[PDB]
Amino acid sequence: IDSSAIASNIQHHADFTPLFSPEHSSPLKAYHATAKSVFDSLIMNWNATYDYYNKVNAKQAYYLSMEFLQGRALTNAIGNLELTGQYAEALKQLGHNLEDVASQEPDPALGNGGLGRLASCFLDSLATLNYPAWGYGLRYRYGLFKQIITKDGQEEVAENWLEMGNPWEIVRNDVSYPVKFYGKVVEGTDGRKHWIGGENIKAVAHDVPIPGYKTKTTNNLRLWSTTVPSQNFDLGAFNAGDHAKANEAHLNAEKICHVLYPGDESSEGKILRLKQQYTLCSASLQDIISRFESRAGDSLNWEDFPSKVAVQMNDTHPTLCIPELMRILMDIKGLSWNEAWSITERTVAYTNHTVLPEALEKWSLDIMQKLLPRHVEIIETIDEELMNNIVSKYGTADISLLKQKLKDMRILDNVDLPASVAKLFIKELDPFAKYDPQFPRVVRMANLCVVGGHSVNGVAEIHSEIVKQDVFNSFYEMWPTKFQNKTNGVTPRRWIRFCNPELSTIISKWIGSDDWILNTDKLAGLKKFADDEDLQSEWRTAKRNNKMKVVSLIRDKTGYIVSPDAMFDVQVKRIHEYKRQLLNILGIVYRYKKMKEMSAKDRRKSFVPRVCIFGGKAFATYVQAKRIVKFITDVAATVNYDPDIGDLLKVVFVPDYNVSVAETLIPASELSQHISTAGMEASGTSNMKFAMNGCLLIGTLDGANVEIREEVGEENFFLFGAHAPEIAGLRQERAEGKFVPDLRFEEVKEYVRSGVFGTSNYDELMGSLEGNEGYGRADYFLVGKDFPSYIECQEKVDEAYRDQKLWTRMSILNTAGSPKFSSDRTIHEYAKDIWDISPVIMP
Amino acid sequence: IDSSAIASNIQHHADFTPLFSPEHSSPLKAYHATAKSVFDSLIMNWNATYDYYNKVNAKQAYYLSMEFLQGRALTNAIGNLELTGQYAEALKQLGHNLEDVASQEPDPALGNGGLGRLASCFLDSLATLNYPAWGYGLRYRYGLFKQIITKDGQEEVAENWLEMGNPWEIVRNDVSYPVKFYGKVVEGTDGRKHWIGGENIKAVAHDVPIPGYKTKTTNNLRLWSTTVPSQNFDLGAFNAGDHAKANEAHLNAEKICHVLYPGDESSEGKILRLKQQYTLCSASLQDIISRFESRAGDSLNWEDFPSKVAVQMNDTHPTLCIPELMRILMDIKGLSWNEAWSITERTVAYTNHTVLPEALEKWSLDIMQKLLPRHVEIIETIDEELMNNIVSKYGTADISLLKQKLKDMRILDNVDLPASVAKLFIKELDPFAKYDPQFPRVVRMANLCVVGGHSVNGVAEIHSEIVKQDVFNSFYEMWPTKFQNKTNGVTPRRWIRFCNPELSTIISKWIGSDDWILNTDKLAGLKKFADDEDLQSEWRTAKRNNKMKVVSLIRDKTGYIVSPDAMFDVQVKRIHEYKRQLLNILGIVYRYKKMKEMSAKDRRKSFVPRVCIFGGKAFATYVQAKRIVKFITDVAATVNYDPDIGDLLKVVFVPDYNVSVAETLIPASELSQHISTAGMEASGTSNMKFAMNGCLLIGTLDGANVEIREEVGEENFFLFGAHAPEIAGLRQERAEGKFVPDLRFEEVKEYVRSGVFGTSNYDELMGSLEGNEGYGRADYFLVGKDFPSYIECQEKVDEAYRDQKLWTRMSILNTAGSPKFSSDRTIHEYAKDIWDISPVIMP
Numbered sequence A, B: 001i002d003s004s005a006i007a008s009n010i011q012h013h014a015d016f017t018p019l020f021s022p023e024h025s026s027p028l029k030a031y032h033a034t035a036k037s038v039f040d041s042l043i044m045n046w047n048a049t050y051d052y053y054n055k056v057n058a059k060q061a062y063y064l065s066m067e068f069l070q071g072r073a074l075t076n077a078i079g080n081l082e083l084t085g086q087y088a089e090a091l092k093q094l095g096h097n098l099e100d101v102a103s104q105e106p107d108p109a110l111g112n113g114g115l116g117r118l119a120s121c122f123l124d125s126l127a128t129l130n131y132p133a134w135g136y137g138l139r140y141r142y143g144l145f146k147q148i149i150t151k152d153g154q155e156e157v158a159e160n161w162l163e164m165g166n167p168w169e170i171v172r173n174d175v176s177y178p179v180k181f182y183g184k185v186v187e188g189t190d191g192r193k194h195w196i197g198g199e200n201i202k203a204v205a206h207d208v209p210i211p212g213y214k215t216k217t218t219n220n221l222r223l224w225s226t227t228v229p230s231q232n233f234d235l236g237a238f239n240a241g242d243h244a245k246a247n248e249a250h251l252n253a254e255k256i257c258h259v260l261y262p263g264d265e266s267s268e269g270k271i272l273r274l275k276q277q278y279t280l281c282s283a284s285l286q287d288i289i290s291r292f293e294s295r296a297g298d299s300l301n302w303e304d305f306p307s308k309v310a311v312q313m314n315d316t317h318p319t320l321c322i323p324e325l326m327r328i329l330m331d332i333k334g335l336s337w338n339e340a341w342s343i344t345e346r347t348v349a350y351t352n353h354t355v356l357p358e359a360l361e362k363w364s365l366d367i368m369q370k371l372l373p374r375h376v377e378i379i380e381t382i383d384e385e386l387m388n389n390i391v392s393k394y395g396t397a398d399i400s401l402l403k404q405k406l407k408d409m410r411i412l413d414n415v416d417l418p419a420s421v422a423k424l425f426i427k428e429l430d431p432f433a434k435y436d437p438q439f440p441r442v443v444r445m446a447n448l449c450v451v452g453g454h455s456v457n458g459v460a461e462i463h464s465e466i467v468k469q470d471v472f473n474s475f476y477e478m479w480p481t482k483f484q485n486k487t488n489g490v491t492p493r494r495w496i497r498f499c500n501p502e503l504s505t506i507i508s509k510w511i512g513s514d515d516w517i518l519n520t521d522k523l524a525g526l527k528k529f530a531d532d533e534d535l536q537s538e539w540r541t542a543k544r545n546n547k548m549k550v551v552s553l554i555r556d557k558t559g560y561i562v563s564p565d566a567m568f569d570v571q572v573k574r575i576h577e578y579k580r581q582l583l584n585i586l587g588i589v590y591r592y593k594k595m596k597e598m599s600a601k602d603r604r605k606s607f608v609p610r611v612c613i614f615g616g617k618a619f620a621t622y623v624q625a626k627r628i629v630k631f632i633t634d635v636a637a638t639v640n641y642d643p644d645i646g647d648l649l650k651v652v653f654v655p656d657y658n659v660s661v662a663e664t665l666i667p668a669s670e671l672s673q674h675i676s677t678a679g680m681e682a683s684g685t686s687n688m689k690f691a692m693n694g695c696l697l698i699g700t701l702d703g704a705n706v707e708i709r710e711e712v713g714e715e716n717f718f719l720f721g722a723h724a725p726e727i728a729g730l731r732q733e734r735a736e737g738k739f740v741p742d743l744r745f746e747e748v749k750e751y752v753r754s755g756v757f758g759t760s761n762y763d764e765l766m767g768s769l770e771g772n773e774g775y776g777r778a779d780y781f782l783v784g785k786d787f788p789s790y791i792e793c794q795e796k797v798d799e800a801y802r803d804q805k806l807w808t809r810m811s812i813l814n815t816a817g818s819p820k821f822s823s824d825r826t827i828h829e830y831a832k833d834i835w836d837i838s839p840v841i842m843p
């Protein structure tokens, strides 16, 4: 299977599955063709893998998520098939360049943060390790948004990734499932419940093959596109002139897949958010059920269901899986409550990803009751049961104790207790056991997930402890055997081998083979070579070579001109008060001010030259975050064009940070920042990407840094800031006026109010770092607190960078320390300890 | 290139361009694959033809139309490539059946009536005869509508043909043209006009190859799909919860291509109707201009434009081509008025298709002025010129005469005359030369088309005379050399060879070859064999064999059970008061009543057994037409289940009449009806299809029947009814109470009011056949008048069918008489006498 045949297959797809005029010649045209030529290998293998799983009828694992940051598939598919050399040559013959062709691929608009990229890494590992597993998600048309950076700060534009269609997917027209909204429940002849009426849509499957590395195993991300049958278009409306009304039905079905995490401060935004989730659950489960039945055939027994199916709820979005499975098993197959509940408990598992409350979903019962009346019936029964198990395991005797246990674990909050439990609170009836109209009736999804899943895990050792101690305590006490940990990871094929081929050469040379790509434990053999100077020379050169690609990026995307002989200092992540991009920039602002009040001789002596690179998207509606990116941009303009500074300091905000950007940025990075308020980050995965590439980490004792420190060693990691235990203390200290800030921190704040950074003075932004009390103020994320610790920590980073022997020694020990953070071992752990699945290898 | 390789190509497309799960097995899946396997041959040849035309830079002809009834492509593509035998065998190997696979193809929803099917026939002839010509149109998503027949009559459902995508098209992503609505005009530095602002959309090309018969020549139907760039989607709107507002821009662009001939009783429906047309013109012309320029290259001279381009305006919908070409030539290329006008005059030509006023488009100036302000400026200048040419060619002297000439030919009606011409009417100023607010300001498009095109033709000899005498008289007088005739035709490959293979065997046998398919004149050699009994036997059997396919159709689509040993009497056409389906059914109702008042012995003696088959769609908003289909259905129920009748008479209304239905119906037909009120049908093409298949015609001296009678001979055609000259006379006779109807016609009307045809008595419908005066009444289409002539004519049809030697002799002479009605010679005529194009044969 040689390069000359491949160049013919490329030509073929350009001409015989064409998207452009024949005489037209574009890199973009070359991409759609090359994509399709590669894809042929994936279809062959996809079908082989599909057919073999059906034969073997092995337990299949199903990963549900609202997010998938797939990123560009081309170079990773080609790389995994090991046709990387030959596709490169093929494109030379045709007057093209692979790097240039690959760069025309649009990033799928299917995700946002770690949650999505984690899921994606997971799928690559799962395929690579021959595990039978699919991903289920929604096919978002416009995604979250494409970030543009103007003079007003961030602006959001809808993404265009599907405008010419996605070559990396396959429409499965025979795979359509009906999904239902609103309606009402009634009891049929056969005493069985029947959910009728309401609005009805159909979800259609779009498959995205996941090619394994050096394996024929090709798994699948099945993506739901919602629509309605053309007949639901209203010609009466259209011919009468009312063209929007004519189109109402199509809009409502289709908007479900328009935007990721749509704004929900409106009742209409909530209903959509909820329709998004139900669709994911309903369509996905129906399909899972379907596959179980065709494989079972004549020998069909539902008790076999949890031994053939594992469903993984990634955060609380897919919670509805639980009652949805109960609906199908009872209303459609005629299983009894306990029979269905037993099966459900053992099929579902839950991973929590953040102690942040935007993930601890609460829903209005009234909305849910209206949209999904049958599911509320089911939850009502589940919550009645849950309370009877609590009654058993505790009280009747101690009522005030029992009262507390019931608040904590209740799924439906502020509802009239079931008759059974209300009994215990007569005096008559206690107000606690009664719905209070002064407050909302709420459905607490996280509790329902804890009840419904046989396993509950977090994503880092510190975090899964927080989960057991702070978040779900009464539940841990009841079912200690539910609670686990599965520390996150990242695929080393996309995040070393294919994003950083230059380093990858150096790695396989000194370890003696390239097997580490798969058996990443074998990177540890670099520890001993850490002080060899010849290794160090190749290692430093590689970093420098990758830095020149970023100089191109910054030049092109922002217009700024930046030298690669400086320290590349990066912070790229979702723009949130808690991740504290604000802390970082203010630290830069302090050094900027010091440089400006200092002689040009001393400037060289005092500070190492840096290029401080920010990136990430600010949730559009999040007002304060958006002001933070605006602010960063303003500082950039002021610093980069100052002749007193020059190449001693540059500050750059790279627009539209996504998988593609990270793939260039990360390998070129020498210092990355992960400086979240301690105990707020659950894990974080860029941490792990950076370390794999020999990037050093400056950060807090928070999430995955903790374990990353353990692996690479305290001496090869820049630690600063208050620790997790001390947080709420330092806050309440602030509340009673007891915190007095560093003199240097007051200096910076006022130097910002000086107005040297444009016509804006930002008294409003600095205002969130002041006062003792009140929402949006009181420096809740401890920026002013950790400030002095931090800027002092940055002095030690300077001094280390001065000894490039040391810096490179440490650089190397981070790569040597990374193997724990391979998504491969994250998968093994999941596979053994939760899913209980076995690999399946085709002959 | 053998059948065994083709079956592999089919398998390949099923697996390597898949639309369904791999284990799924459907006739439908087999179609999409087979379609794609055939398509590969078309792409090869499409590109060969494309490239060769560019080389030769031969004058290209461009057919613009709002309609294209393409019909199913599969068997016609396969047939034209002459791979018909081998594709049939290929499908047997794969466990499938071509007829069964072909029947899964959805009819494109791209047309409605003759206008569309004519255009389509034309494209097949043009490719077949090696003429360089494209068709330009819009890609309608939901089409006009899918007709369903319920107990309430007709109901309209939006068509679903694109739900899985069209295998027979190619998206040309590099071909996008901006189209602009509203806005305003301003004068730039360079004294040149500039149209700025307003709403902006983009039209994208979708190509549909037109394979020629036994030729490599593969021409093109370029179809415009309107949209906007994803960035015009409003995230602010979406995140705020206002999901319709977020989507407003996309809806407005996209709705342009949603429905064919959208209802326009609303100002909003008119603006759309107009946006549809402008888009067709604007996008198409820009593309034409573009191709001219790339072929011209360095040697570019605009005086060469009409020697390289011919644009054909099919009816008044593409009228805007005229001022649109003027816009581009002046505002974009900088040609002067006379330079651009000279070129425009010689590029554009106009075909009028009906003296019916829904085609003689009048537009409100105020709407047009708002939507297309620059185009009105241009029309204003054209109308000023037109009036100066009339001033020259007539008056100043005779003013009342000149007044009359100006009313008739004026493009803008009820507008203030230009200063120049207003001069001639001072007394002061004559009210005639002044805008009267008591009436609308109107733009008369047909006049503009006459002014703008170097040729004006009709579509049958009688009609093109009507056009010169009645419709455009003053214009004919001014420019007699503009006015022509091009009698319509139909492609004999789709309408004999491939719809009727059984007959096609018989044809090539007795003529000695199959060259007639191409050189259809050679059917004339059948005249002499008309009385050979062995020919007659094969001929009768074929008809009977094709009738058994219709028994299946009627059984399946309506549920009625009908014997093929009866006369198959068909009327299938758009349901219009003027085509007079009402006349036909009432004639049936008369025979029904006669049979019911008669002994069962006499019933056999008096009437030949018939199956009377109606079909066609009633424009949804057209209230009276819809009542006519309702009525027909009610009669069907009453007649078909009457034991006194049995198989002596059946009446059937076939739902959703389209190309596909006609392909089964026509070859099986023995009598077809074309009974329009004389002088109202321009041509008609089903006439010609029926005759080609040996179907006899009963009809009026109207449109193409006239010439069809001339060809097959008066003795082989059933003529009835008042003639064209006598019409308006018979009407005004009615107006002054002088018409007294036949006693048998009053009998039928009252027998309908009897209520024997269901709970409806239809006094409202019969009401349109009564009175002397008033809109919707007064029997304007002369149903009661022609009635006695007609039912008596049907007695002669009975008596002829009794002598099957005679009937079959006549059947044969109709096929022998058809060659004139081949779209091939219609094309030759157009090509020589209007377009002035030459064929181009590749080596």
Ligand SMILES: OC[C@H]1O[C@H](O[C@H]2[C@H](O)[C@@H](O)[C@@H](O[C@H]3[C@H](O)[C@@H](O)[C@@H](O[C@H]4[C@H](O)[C@@H](O)[C@H](O)O[C@@H]4CO)O[C@@H]3CO)O[C@@H]2CO)[C@H](O)[C@@H](O)[C@@H]1O
Pocket (backbone or CB within 6 Å): A067, A112, A113, A114, A115, A116, A261, A315, A353, A354, A358, A359, A574, A576, A619, A621, A622, A623
């Ligand atoms: O992949 C990364 C994470 O993804 C998921 O988190 C998403 C949330 O579930 C989703 O709701 C959304 O959350 C945004 C809020 O909707 C939005 O209001 C805002 O929150 C602000 C609020 O606007 C403001 O009034 C207040 O002062 O501050 C709030 C934050 O403290 O922003 C939210 C996100 O930035 O977006 C999330 C992804 O961006 C998973 O749930 C999570 O576990 C993953 O880590």
Ligand SMILES: OC[C@H]1O[C@H](O[C@H]2[C@H](O)[C@@H](O)[C@@H](O[C@H]3[C@H](O)[C@@H](O)[C@@H](O[C@H]4[C@H](O)[C@@H](O)[C@H](O)O[C@@H]4CO)O[C@@H]3CO)O[C@@H]2CO)[C@H](O)[C@@H](O)[C@@H]1O
Pocket (backbone or CB within 6 Å): B067, B112, B113, B114, B115, B116, B261, B315, B353, B354, B358, B359, B574, B576, B619, B621, B622, B623
């Ligand atoms: O392909 C066949 C023909 O196509 C084109 O004709 C189309 C018309 O241009 C288009 O406007 C439309 O016309 C329909 C009217 O819009 C609709 O109102 C109705 O007209 C009725 C009216 O509703 C009613 O009030 C009155 O009593 O009677 C009117 C008719 O006399 O129906 C019209 C069509 O049935 O549809 C046409 C195609 O269906 C070409 O223009 C034409 O030349 C072709 O022959």
Ligand SMILES: OC[C@H]1O[C@H](O[C@H]2[C@H](O)[C@@H](O)[C@@H](O)O[C@@H]2CO)[C@H](O)[C@@H](O)[C@@H]1O
Pocket (backbone or CB within 6 Å): A577, A774, A775, A776, A777, A778, A780
């Ligand atoms: O982004 C989340 C939000 O959390 C904090 O809200 C505090 C607030 O200070 C209190 O008044 C009360 O409302 O407790 C909340 C935490 O439980 C921050 O105040 C705010 O800055 C931050 O944006």
Ligand SMILES: OC[C@H]1O[C@H](O[C@H]2[C@H](O)[C@@H](O)[C@@H](O)O[C@@H]2CO)[C@H](O)[C@@H](O)[C@@H]1O
Pocket (backbone or CB within 6 Å): B577, B774, B775, B776, B777, B778, B780
């Ligand atoms: O479908 C068209 C429509 O045409 C006729 O309208 C007549 C009408 O009778 C007159 O009162 C005046 O309005 O002249 C028109 C023709 O110029 C028919 O009357 C009507 O039945 C028919 O539907």
Ligand SMILES: *Cc1c(COP(=O)(O)O)cnc(C)c1O
Pocket (backbone or CB within 6 Å): A069, A112, A113, A114, A117, A572, A573, A574, A657, A658, A659, A660, A662, A683, A684, A685, A686, A687, A689
């Ligand atoms: C790895 C990755 C993330 C997650 O980063 P955190 O460190 O968890 O904030 C987000 N976005 C993209 C594009 C990534 O590649």
Ligand SMILES: *Cc1c(COP(=O)(O)O)cnc(C)c1O
Pocket (backbone or CB within 6 Å): B069, B112, B113, B114, B117, B572, B573, B574, B657, B658, B659, B660, B662, B683, B684, B685, B686, B687, B689
């Ligand atoms: C030929 C044809 C027509 C045109 O028929 P007329 O006799 O002009 O009314 C309309 N529709 C279809 C599907 C056809 O095949």
